[PDB]
From a paper:
We purified N4 virions to homogeneity and determined the high-resolution structure of phage N4 tails from filled virions (FV) and empty particles (EP) to 3.2 Å and 3.6 Å, respectively.
The massive 3,500-residue vRNAP 18,19, present in 4 ± 1 copies inside the mature virion 20, is ejected into the host upon infection. In stark contrast to the N4 transcriptional program, which has been studied extensively 17, many key questions about the role of phage N4 vRNAP as an ejection protein and its part in the DNA ejectosome remain unanswered. vRNAP (gp50) consists of three predicted domains: a likely membrane-spanning N-terminal domain (NTD), a single-subunit RNA polymerase (RNAP) domain, and a large C-terminal domain of unknown function (CTD). In this study, we use a complementary top-down and bottom-up approach by determining the cryo-EM structures of both the full-length recombinantly expressed vRNAP and the fully asymmetric N4 virion tail.
Author numbering:
A (entry chain PB), B (entry chain PA): 612 to 662
Write the structure that this text describes.
């Protein structure tokens, strides 16, 4: 019978959750990019108004 | 019969979604670049006005 390694099964679980956070990583930065761009839209909208 | 690995099928699914976010990644940054450039257009338009 194979005797599973307590270290090995621990790391493999963490790598599974690691991939999930690496994916939530991008989603968070999508919300950051579009917020910055849409903010720059607002600060150029009033700049034309002063023109 | 092949016995699919619960870890393997989990990661392969995440890699599929990973590629999709890596693609939405670019689209978000396109919206950031053109917002910055068009904002710089506005802040040079009024600069000529002061001239």
């Amino acid at each position: 019978q194979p005797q599973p390694d307590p270290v090995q099964e621990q790391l493999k679980q963490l790598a599974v959750e690691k991939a999930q956070l690496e994916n939530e990583e991008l989603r968070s930065k999508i919300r950051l990019n579009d917020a910055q761009a849409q903010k720059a839209m607002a600060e150029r909208d009033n700049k034309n108004l002063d023109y």
